[model samples]
Target: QYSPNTQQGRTSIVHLFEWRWVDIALECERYLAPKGFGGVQVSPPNENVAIYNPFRPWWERYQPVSYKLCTRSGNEDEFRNMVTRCNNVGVRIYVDAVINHMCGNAVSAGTSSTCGSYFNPGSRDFPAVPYSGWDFNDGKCKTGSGDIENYNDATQVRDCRLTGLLDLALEKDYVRSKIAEYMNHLIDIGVAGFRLDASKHMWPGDIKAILDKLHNLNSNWFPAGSKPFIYQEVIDLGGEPIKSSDYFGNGRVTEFKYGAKLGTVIRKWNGEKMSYLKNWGEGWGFVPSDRALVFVDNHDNQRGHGAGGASILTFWDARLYKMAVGFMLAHPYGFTRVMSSYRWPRQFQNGNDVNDWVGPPNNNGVIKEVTINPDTTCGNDWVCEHRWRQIRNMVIFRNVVDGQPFTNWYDNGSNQVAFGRGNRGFIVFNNDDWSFSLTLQTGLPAGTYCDVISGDKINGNCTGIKIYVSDDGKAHFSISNSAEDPFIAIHAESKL
Candidate 1:
């Protein structure tokens, strides 16, 4: 379950946040496969509430209405088409499985679902799945408000509603079977795995039971015995009764501390420094790399919604964000997931975004299709951070250095640092207050390599900075603190 099940030599996954099914299929054929990206973490593909008060906020997609594979992304046919097309091109699709709960209890019950499925949150009834009051945790929740009021209490965190979402009684065999049925349908459709949403809110034992019922990956694309990869969303930053290790038996857990600490170190916040990152991953109190799914920022935290706090970097902080992402991809820590987000009208009043709830680019609640520009970047307000030259190239860098040991570490005992992935790749960072210029051992054979962070190496020529390594594998590196990207990277693939 820990394995991403990507094609050989492919590495990182990109979260195509709130993108459409047809567009994902097109992207798999045109961009992702060609760029060597492993897979895509798509927004919830199932039916969700059609929020209107906030005018289709992104969070509405997390509020499941039913598992009908019908949403703003597309209908069931479009979704199946996307899975087949993406798999045909060697790109895998990982669905965001929102199984911990359903729509918020306070939401008015009606036919207000993406697929027009009738549901009544107040009555704990969903006709599409035929789930009734018996399938909810109404009687089991000990909280007076019936919602998770304290993170310190383990039981309440699991059994109670998460921010008023209808908590499913996953402990029940009937509930487990229904959730498994929905997931099995996806596996049969050729999906490689799932990102179990809110896994922290469900008991680890119950989650395993649900997973035990899922079918193997479709034999057409995967091996006959391939189990669907499982990565649960368990935000354990310590002090909580529920630890990430509790769910390790199920699959990989999202290492929230990786991003939170990386953000702090990159921002030099609270006296943290790049030199301190020499001992990253488990050294920094993160779960084991193999059992961890890591990212710099996710859908929730980017908008100040999840764990990372103010230190979290987003596309808004382009230069710093790129540095953070580049560092993550270069380092051998955990399975990397890059964030590809869309632009929203950010109306901040005293450090708070009053318009953070705004949805994707839309016309009266209908999501706009992703439009590709001539340079291959996305349009229609999509940030497409994954398409940026630096990020796109770094994604390839990770693939090139896969299985290489982290070696040749160098640092100025401050913000500036340099490291190598064995002899396959090398990277340098200049986050200090001053320019960095030094001759260092790069651990690569004598050659000229293109700095992928700046531009591309096309047709045997570099369009960006070029680093020349001597016979002894020593190279003179230079980066000004004022440079646009403040970092450079070279890999075996970029060698000329």
Candidate 2:
């Protein structure tokens, strides 16, 4: 469960948020596999309530109507094709498993599901899954509102409805079996693992029970007896009754603090400095590196829906966002996941986006296909951050520096900082208000290397800035604060 189960030498996964399965299958062959990305964390694949009141908001996918493998992303066959094609190219697929609850109780019952499944949320009846009111936690919830009102009360948080979504009675043997059967079906279809959604709303024991009933991975691609990688989403930022550590017994837990803290530091919030990141991982009050799934920003937080608050960085802050992503990939902290998103009409009225609930780039409720521009940038409003020169190179940089130790730390006692991943890679950042110029020890072998952030090295020639490492492993670096990318990175793979 702890292992990501990616192909050897691959080091990072990208969250293809709200991407279609057919598009993902093509992406695996055309980009991800060739670029050395480890895997893709796809949006929830199960059938979900198709909410039209908010014009098909993204959150509707979180409200499961049934375990049927169908959604705006694709149907079961399309999903299977994506999994097979991606796995064939050494790229894995991780599903967003939304099993903690069903659709919101307040929603009217109808056939308004992604797969056209019939579900009556008010009565807790989902005929598609054959789950009735007895399968829910309506009677088990002790809260007056039958909803999670107090986060400090861990029991209510687990038993009560999350924002009025009917909570599932996962403790029941039948419920556990049903959920496990759905997951096993996905496993049999060749998914690498799952990103357990709304994990904080479910009890740890209940989650373990469901996991216990899961079968091993599909032997056609994975080794016999291999368990699916499980990463539970638990938003723990301290002062919360339930800590992320509580779920460590199951598998990796999403380290919400990792992104929140990183955003704060990069944005210079609360007087945070880049130099203070010298002791990043365990030293900064985060979970153990191996047990953490870290990212600069996630789907929920980028739109101010989940943790990390407003300081969270996204593609909207392109320059700083790339810097943060580069820093994450270069550092040896935790398992990394990059976020790929699309643009929406962001209209802020009195500091709030009244259109935050708007769904993906769609025309008349049908999602638009992802179109690739001539420069490899995404068209149709897709902000493919994973394809950016700086981010794409950093992804490869991590692959090159895999298993190397963190060393050769240097900082200006402010925002200017530099670090090396053993002798395989080195990265420097200049977040200060002035130009940064220094000849520092890179710890890399003497060679002429291409600074991957600015451009790429092709046909033995660099199309970007080049750095010459002397015999003593010293390299001169310079970056003005006004530069397009405020940082530079060089790795063994970029060495000429």
Candidate 3:
């Protein structure tokens, strides 16, 4: 499965948003592999057009110029080396596949440090991949501006450019071959899989045609039978003509609404019944769990770029984000991806790539140095929601409890949340501003366990608050209204 890099057990994936390739390799060795992360969601490892207006917009990454793994992150050699080093230590890499479109204007490889060649799309020329104007889908766009302006018609949706990015003619054999070559190159380089961007715009059948051309997962890191895992970006809220079911045959489709449920429940968490969480999955108008890739927030929606509303909960509100993500991971619904972002944009539409080749603007992402809070976690400028103690712990919890059906769910109708994970671990959440006093059903043996939501437990006593479950599998505890950390937990480990 795509959950973890290996076929071992149910684990979780982390999106290390926009971190340099060198940092990612170090993290896998020092932190992630030991903590049991499934894999990582690295930024687009493709070349994008050199745009001077936005001073390196995040969207520019979506405006791919070529398949070369050279962008703001690093060049192809560094990328390949990072993949090898991470996988050597049991960590897996999942590339963010930005194949939807290319830059409107092309420049020489000198424009961006990542690419070495230049191609100008405005001139219908891309010598990097040797793509000329004849290669674009200009004639297929129904919009007057040759851009994607309609969602009602699938033809225009897949055929037209997204956000004025040059659209490819997938119907053309040469184009398909070009795409296959790029994907196969990554697949051959030992990347585990891809998160297809803006997949809702393309026809599933067309996607399948490309998938068919992809080479099997490289045998170096992955087992021989492994195929390149796929989780496409499909932001469907059910009414669109292009249902997620349309893409199920290829692989997992992103479940954009899972975070919405977390947002809703967390806001009303004071003593609310937890049945609504069980009402998740297709019952909530989403695809089945096996074919669903879920998250609390994504690269686009977190900053209100692609989607917005009361359905969203970002790091701005820690309690709500914890409650939303904690419960999502607890309940067995879909393949979960915990968002780890860098910087929050003042304007959601701001770009997140290089400013210029000569002097590319800095301050591009949320986590760039200044965003580090006193805790060495995150600053207010960055919503490193993925690094929250409660949220990050749940990633391991989800992995430990994978394949175990929901059991022992208990909600106090107001401020407390408690649940068991496939008989392996049990967790609780208390978001009430005031201290919470509640008797809970914590189905673990009476023992001291490390409160993963806070700090590690060392010596004879627990490092954080100790919640003792009586011999009979019942525990009573109070959540401090004054504790710096607002949550607590005791898993099957730390047998005391």
Q: Candidate 1 on 85-192: residue-level lDDT in tens? A: 999999999999999999999999999999999999988889999799999999999999999999999999999999999999999999899999999999999999
Clashes of each: 0, 0, 23
Give candidate 1 regions above 4 Å deviation: none
Report residue 25 deviation for candidate 3 (angstroms): 1.0
lDDT of 3 by residue, 1-496 (tens): 3333454753678888777787677777766787777788898888876555545566667777777777777778878888888788777788898766777543333355246456666676777786887888887777887876778777778888777778877767787888889989988888888988889877788788888898878887777778888998988875766788888888888887777666656666444434455455678777888898888888677664445345578776766677677777777887778888655324322353222111212554322432445664755444456566677677777777777776677655555666776546777766666777777777677765677676655676666566777777787767786665555666665445
TM-scores for candidates 1 onward, in order: 0.99, 0.99, 0.88
Q: What lDDT does candidate 3 reach at residue 83?
A: 87
Error of 3 at 4 (Å): 5.3
Flag clash pairs in model 2.
Answer: none
- Of candidate 3, the 10-residue stretch with the lowest lDDT total is 352-361
**lDDT of candidate 3?**
0.71
For model 1, give the RMSD to the true fold: 0.8
Better of 1 and 3 by TM-score: 1
Question: Which consecutive 10 residues in model 1 have the weakest lDDT in total?
Answer: 303-312
